[PDB]
Amino acid sequence: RGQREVFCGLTGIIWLHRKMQDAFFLVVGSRTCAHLLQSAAGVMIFAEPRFGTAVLEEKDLAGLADANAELDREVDRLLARRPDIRQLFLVGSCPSEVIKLDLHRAAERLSAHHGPAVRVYNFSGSGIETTFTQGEDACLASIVPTLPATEARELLLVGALPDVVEDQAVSLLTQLGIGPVRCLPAHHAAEAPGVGPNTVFALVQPFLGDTHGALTRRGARHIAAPFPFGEEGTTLWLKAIADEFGVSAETFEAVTAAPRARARKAVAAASEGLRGKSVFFLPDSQLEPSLARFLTRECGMSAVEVGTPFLHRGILGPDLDLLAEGPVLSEGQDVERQLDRVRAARPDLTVCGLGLANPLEAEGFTTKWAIELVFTPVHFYEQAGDLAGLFSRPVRRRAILR
Amino acid sequence: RGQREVFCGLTGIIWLHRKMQDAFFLVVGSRTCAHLLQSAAGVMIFAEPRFGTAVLEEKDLAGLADANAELDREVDRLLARRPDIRQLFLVGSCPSEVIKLDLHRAAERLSAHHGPAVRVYNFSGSGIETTFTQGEDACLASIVPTLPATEARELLLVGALPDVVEDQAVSLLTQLGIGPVRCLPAHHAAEAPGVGPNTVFALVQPFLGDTHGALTRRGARHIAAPFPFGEEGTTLWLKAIADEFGVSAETFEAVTAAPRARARKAVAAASEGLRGKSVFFLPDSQLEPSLARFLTRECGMSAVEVGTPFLHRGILGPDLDLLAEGPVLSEGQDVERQLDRVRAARPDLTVCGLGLANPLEAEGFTTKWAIELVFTPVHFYEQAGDLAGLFSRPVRRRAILR
Amino acid sequence: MKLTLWTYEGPPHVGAMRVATGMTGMHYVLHAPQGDTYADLLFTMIERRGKRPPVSYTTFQARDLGSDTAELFQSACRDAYERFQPQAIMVGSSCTAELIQDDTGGLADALSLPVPVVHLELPSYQRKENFGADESFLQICRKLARPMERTEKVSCNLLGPTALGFRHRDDILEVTRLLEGMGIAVNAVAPMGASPADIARLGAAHFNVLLYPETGESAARWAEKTLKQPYTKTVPIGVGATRDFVAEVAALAGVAPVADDSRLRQPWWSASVDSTYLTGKRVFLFGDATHVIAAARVARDEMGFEVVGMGCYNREFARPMRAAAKGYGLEALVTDDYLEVEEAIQALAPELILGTQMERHIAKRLGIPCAVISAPVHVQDFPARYSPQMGFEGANVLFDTWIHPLTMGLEEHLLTMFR
Amino acid sequence: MKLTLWTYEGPPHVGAMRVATGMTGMHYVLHAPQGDTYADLLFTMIERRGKRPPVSYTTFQARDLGSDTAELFQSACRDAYERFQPQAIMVGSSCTAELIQDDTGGLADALSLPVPVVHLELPSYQRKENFGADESFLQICRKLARPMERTEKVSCNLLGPTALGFRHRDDILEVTRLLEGMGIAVNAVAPMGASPADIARLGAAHFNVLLYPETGESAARWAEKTLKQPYTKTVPIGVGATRDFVAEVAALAGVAPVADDSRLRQPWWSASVDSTYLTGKRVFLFGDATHVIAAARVARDEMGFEVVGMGCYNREFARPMRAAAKGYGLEALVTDDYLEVEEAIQALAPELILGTQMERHIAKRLGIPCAVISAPVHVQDFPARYSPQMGFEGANVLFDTWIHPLTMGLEEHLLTMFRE
Ligand code: PMR
Ligand code: PMR
Ligand SMILES: [Cu+2]
Ligand SMILES: [Cu+2]
8 A cells, every 4th residue: 555656437437438529527626627627638638528527616615515616507508518428527526526526416516407408417526535547437336326227138338438349349249140249338328228136237348347247236137257368358248249149159150250360370470579478467447367367378468467546346356266276366556566576676667657658768667558458449259459569569669668 | 145044944934833734844943853853843852743853864964866775665654654644744844955966856656646735845944045934935936836727716815813803804805805815825735725827915924924935926016014913013014915905995994993993992902011111123033123113113122233134125115114214224144243232222021042142131132032933823913912922021021120 | 716728837736747757766756646647747748748747646535634634644644655765755735635634744854764755735726836846846855955065167057947837858959059058167067867866966067057947946035045156047048048157157157258159040040031021020028937038038139020919928927928928019918818918919919920739820810921939839849859949959949840830831831822 | 785764872073062062162074075064963853952062074975076075175164263263173985085096195194284183093984883972082182182281189080971871970079079979170171071172171181980891992992002191890789889999080080988878879779678579570672882881780789670682782892791691691792773672672571671772662562661771862852950860879870770660561450450
C-alpha cells in the first residue's frame, strides 16, 4: 500500500462516449477533473466531444439545494445546445463526492423533468472510489438496475466493444447459429435492449465487475470463460458459449476452424520478436491477467509478475486456470516498490502505466502502455494478430534503434 | 547596347498556355530553355501543364535530318498521349535558331499529315529574335495567317485578356450596342475568328505589334485607342471603339457611367499612398507607357522616365500623347547604366524585373516587378483599384517596415 | 457552475508542479485523491521528460478518511525524504485535498525534516495554473533565497522559465547567448535549470532578467524589495523587442550593447519582394499576455501585418493586455472561454491566427491559416530542434513559423487554380 | 530528342554561377543570348541575396552574330572588369554560344586583364549542373590554389558548399562549431564564404572536409593529388554519421575526439513511447546521392523506418548509390526522369516520402506524407531559421522535419475519426 499511479475513473468516459452517441457525460467536478478530461482526450477535445464538466466554485460547494439547482440549470442549457442527447450521465467526481451532492436524487429529479424522452442515469467515477477501467463498468453498472425486464432466453455481449469487433462477435455467434445477441451498451437509448432472468450474460472485458453484480441482481447467471484475447482465449470463449447453449462441438469447430487458423498465423508472425522474452505487468487497466496469459502461451513469453488494481477471482477464474503458476499475482499498487521490483527483474518488455512508460525507457527498459489496448481493437480472432503486434512493436523498435 | 535583363520569349508561353486550352506549346530548345520554363512556372509545372521542351542532344545538333525525324516522332507520341490537343505550337528557341532547323516547314509537314483535326503552327520565342511579351505577339501573329477570310463586318478584340476580364469586356461592349465581337486568342480552333477587309480589330495590349502588322495584310483596320488599363483609359478605348462602330456618345456615356464611378473610387482608394511620389520604369514588358500614364494622371505619381524594350509609336501614340511631356522615353536596355540612372534618380518606386528587384531593395529603393501585371487581371474598370493597390503595396510595406 | 469543455489553464497544483520538475533535487509531496497522477505524465509525454516528475501523491481513497488522510500525508512525506532524497521539499494540496480540512504545513513541520520544507497555500477554485506556478516560485524564493554578497563579474538571473512551457529551453539558450555576447554571466536560471542551492544564489546576481512575467513577476518584485535586485520589464521576443531588451540589460549592467545580429535574417527576408503580399494581412492573436503582446508588436512592425484581434487568457494580465490593445486601436479579449474567442474569430474573420492549440484547431475548422505562439501546446509543438521564440534567431524562427501557413495556403490555392 | 517538363538539374553553366555567387570577388562572364538572365534571379529570391549575383551576360541577338559575338564578349568582359573590379574572372559559354564557333578562351586572353582569368570548358548538352559546379570549383582551385606552407596549428577546409544549395549556410555553421569543439579552427570555406585570396589559402590547411561531394569532390581529389590534402569521406548527416565524421576528422587532425552531445535530443525522442508508431514505416528516398544515402542511414538506424525506395538523379554518383542501396536490400533508381520516380512511388506506395520538391508534390497528389531533403527546392524550403542538416542539431532538425508530416496526418486522421 502506498502511492498508486492510475487514472481516476472519469478517464473511462473518453472511450465510452464513442460507443454511445446519444449519451452525454456531464461530469460534476472541479478544475482538476476538467483538466484530466481535456488532457487525456487530447485530440478529441477539438472535435466537439460529448463530455462536459460543470466546475464547482466556492459558492457552489456551499450547500446542496443550491448546487442541485445550478446543476439542473446547467443541464437545461446543455439540452438547449444538444436536444439530440436523451441519456445523460451525471458522473460523480472526488470533489462532488466530498460535497456529498446526491447524484441519485438528481437523477430522479432530472428524469421526472424530461420523462418521456430524455432519461438520465448517474454513476460515479471518482478517484477515491473508481480507477481507470472501473470507470467504464461503473457507467454500465448504473444503467443495468434500470433497464426493462424480458422473458426471452437470450445471449448478450456485456461490455463496450469497438463496432468492428462488435460486428465480428455478432457474426461469429450467428455462425454458431443458436442464441440471439443483444449487446448491453446501447449506442442509442431507443435501441435499448431488455435484460432479465431469461437472459444469460457472457463477459467480454475483465474489469466489468460492478456490472457482474448488477446483472446478478437482475437474475441472469454468469457463464465463466477465458476472455477474448488471442486465438486460444476467444476459442474457449466461443466454446463456453456453445456449451451454455448446447451448440454441438463439431459445428463450433467447423465454424471456428478457418478464423482460428488465421488468428494463429497472425500471432505466430508477431510473436517471433517476443519468443523467449520476459514481461512485467504494472497494474493499470485490469486487462493484465488475460494479456499475460495470451503472451505466455500464444506468444511464448515469460511473465515475471501480473499486477492488478483490483482482482476479481470470480470472473478471472478460467483465465487464471489457463494462466501458468509462474508469475506472481499482485492486487493493489505500490508504485515505488513495483518500480524497484521491475528494475530488479530487468524485463525485456514492461506493460506499464503511461506516466511511467517514458521514465522506464530512460532507465533502459522497453515498455508497452495498456491504454492503447483499451482503445485499439485487440479482442477476438482477427484483431489477435494486431494484439500481438502491439507488444511486439516496442521490442522491435528497441532492437532496430540499438 | 550592352547587358540586357529581359527574358526570352518562352516565358510568354506559360500564360498563353493558361489562356489557350486547346493549344500545346512544344518548345524545341536546349536544357537551358527547359530550365527557364521550369523556374518561371514554379508551381505550374507540378500541375502537368501544356508546355514541354524537346531538349536537343549532341547528336540532335550534329544531324539536321535526324533532328527533324525525332521531332516528328515526338509530335506523334504527343498526339497519341494527348488526344485533346487540337492545335500545337512549335516554339523557336535560341539553339534551334542556331541549328537552322526550319520549324515553319516542320509545322507545314505536321499539319499536312496530322490534319484536319490537328492544326500545326510555328512561332519563334528565341531571345535572339523575340523578347519577353513579343512571344505572345509571335504566337498571336502566327495564328492569323490561317484565319478564314470573312465577308461580314466583325469586331476583333486582340490580346490575352483574362477570362473574367474577357467576359466583362464582352458584356460591356454588347451593352454599348456594337455588333458582333470576336477574340483573336480563341480557346478553341473552331472558335478562331475570321478576318477580312470589312473586319476590324482593336488591340487590348501595346506589345501586340506584329499582330497589328499581320492583320493589316488581310484587310483588317486598327482602332486608334489608348489601352484600357484603368478608369479613363478604358473610357477612351471604349469610346474609340464606339466611334468606329457609330455608337453615339450619349448612349455610350449612359452605359459607362456606372462602371466609371466605381473605377474612380477604387483608384482613389489606393492612390493615397502614391500621392506625391516618383516612379521609375525599367524596360521589361513593353507595358510601361500605359501604366505610366495611369500613374501620372490618375494616381498623380511623378514619372522620371519610361522605359520600353522596343516602343511601337503607332499603337502607343494615344497613350504617349496622354502621357506628359516631362517623362523621357528609354529605347533599348543597358541595365548596368540603368542602375546608375536609378541611383541618380532615387525614385520612391522603381518598376523593374523580378531579377533586379531584391538588389535594388537592399539599396533602399522600393521596387515593383512588372511581370505581375501580365498575370493579375488589371485591365478595364473593375481592376483599376487592383492595379493601384498593386503599385501602392510595396510603398506601404516600406513605410511600415521603416 | 458553467460547464467547461476546454480549459486554457489547469488547477494551480499543476502550475506549482511545473516548478518542481524544472528544479533539480526539489521533490514535492502533494495531497491528491488516488487518480490525480494524470498530470505527472504531462512532462513525461508533452515535454518528453526522461525523469519521473518529483511528485509523490498521497493518493487517498474512500476507505481512508479523517485521521487516515493525515496518516497518508505523513507517510508520503516520510517516504519521499527517506528514499527520493530531495535537496528541498515543498508541500501542496489538490482541489479535493483543499476541500477537506487538510493542513499541508502542519504535518510537514511536525516531521521536522532536515531539508527545508516550503508550505504552499493555493486557492484551487479561485486561481489557475499560472498563479500556482508564480506563487510556488515566490514561496521557494522566500524560503531559500537570502541576500548574499554580489558576484565579481556582472551576474544576471533568468527568472520565469518553468517546465511544460512554450519554447522555454530554446529561449533560455538564446537569452544566454545574448547575455554572453553582452559580457554578462548568468548567475542562475530558475526554475528550469534551478536547484535549491541555485535559489540560495539568487541574491548574488546584480540584476534579474524576467523572461516570463506569468511565472516570475512575484519573485522579481520580492527580489526587488528584499534582495535589492532590479528586474527588466521588457521581454525579448522579436527584433525590436530584442534590441530594446539589449539596451535595457546594457543599461542595468553597465556593459556595452554587443548584440550579434549576424544571425539575423528576419528583417531582410521580410523586406524582400517575396513578402510583399504579407502587407496588410489580418491577424488574430490569443494566448498568454506576454506572448500575444510581443507577437502583435512583431506582426505590426516587422512582419507588416494589421493586428486585427488581440486577447489573453490570463485574467491576471488584464491591464497590460488592455493597454497594449489600446496601443493598436483594439480592445483586449481577456477571456478564459474558447467560445468567446471563437465568436470573435467568426465575426472578425482574420486572414491568419496566432495562438494556442485551441486557437489553431478553431482556425482549422474555419479553414484559415494557423500558427502556434502560446503556452497551451501539443506534444508535436514541443520541438526536438532548436526553435527559440526570443532573441535574434528567435526572430527568424518567428518569421518562418508565421509565414509557413500563408505560404502553404498560397501554394495550395495556386496549384488548385492551375489544375 | 525527349520531351522533358521537369529537370532535376539545370544546364551546366548554372552550377558555375552558383560557385560565382558563393565566393566574393569572383565574376562570371557568360557568353549567352539575351533572355538567359533567368538564372541570375534564383539566387536573389530562392537564396535571397542582397546583392546581384556577380555574373555578366553578353546578351547577343540576331544582330550580334558571327564576329559581332566575339566583339560583344570582348566588350562585356572588359566592362565587367572595369566596373566590378573583381579579384578574379571566369568566362563560360551557354548552349547557344556553344553552338557557334566562338571561343571564350581567345577572347578572354586577348584582353589580357591583370586579374587572373579562369577558363571554363563545360559540355553543355552532354553534361549537367552539378558537374558544372564541380568543374568550375576545380578550375578555380587550379588557377588560384598553390602549394603553400601549412598553418602553425590544425586548420581545415570545408569543401562543397555552393550557392543555391540545400541548407548549405546552416550546415556551415554546424560543422564549424563541431570543428571548434573538437579543437580544429576552420582555415577557409569554399565556394561559399570564399574569396580569391581564400582559394589560394587552401594549401595552408592540414586536411580537407568534403561536406558535399556533388560540387566539391573534384577539388578534394585534386588537393590530395597536388596540395597533399587528405579529405574526409564521411558526410556528417545524422547522429551515427556525425560520430563517424567526428572520429575520422579527429584521426586526421590527431586531436582527441570531443563532440558536444548536450544539444542532441533526437535519439531520446525517437526512443520515447511517442515514437513507437514510427517503427516499420516505409519511406521512399530520392534526390542527390549524398543526402539520400545519409537520410536512408538516419531513417533505418534511428528513425526505425524501413527504406523501401532509394534513388538519385546524379549519374556521376550512380555507383555509391547502388552500393549503398544494396546494404538495405534494394536496387537503386538512378534516373533523371520524373515519370520513372512517380511510377516507382506508385508501385511502392510508401507511407512517407523524403525527396526533392518534385517528390513532395508527387506525394501531395498521392496523399502521402512528404518531406524535402534534396537539392531541387523552392523559396519555401530555404529557411530564415537555423535549419542545418548536419551535426547533432541537424539530427534534431531531421527528426522534427521528418516526423512533422506523419504527426500532421495522424492528427488529421484522429480528428476525422473523432467527428466524421
Ligand atoms: C492522462 C492524460 C494524458 C494526456 C496528457 C494525453 C495526451 C496524449 N496522449 Mg492521451 N493523454 C494522456 C493519457 C491518456 N490519453 C488517453 C488516450 C490515448 C491514447 C490511446 C493515445 C494517447 C496518447 C497520448 C500522448 C502522446 C501524443 C500522441 O501520440 O498523439 C499525449 C501527450 C497517444 C500516444 O501515442 O501515446 C504515446 C495515443 O495514441 N492517449 C487516455 C484516456 C483513457 C489517457 C489517460
Ligand atoms: C527568371 C526566373 C524566375 C523564376 C525562378 C520565377 C519564379 C518565382 N518568381 Mg517570378 N520567377 C522568375 C521570373 C518570372 N517569374 C514569373 C512568374 C511569377 C509570379 C506569378 C510570381 C513570381 C514570383 C517569383 C518567386 C518567389 C516565389 C514566392 O513567392 O514564394 C519565384 C522564385 C512570386 C513573387 O514574386 O512573390 C510574390 C510571384 O508571385 N513569379 C515569370 C513567368 C512568366 C517569370 C519569367
Ligand atoms: Cu504545416
Ligand atoms: Cu505541412
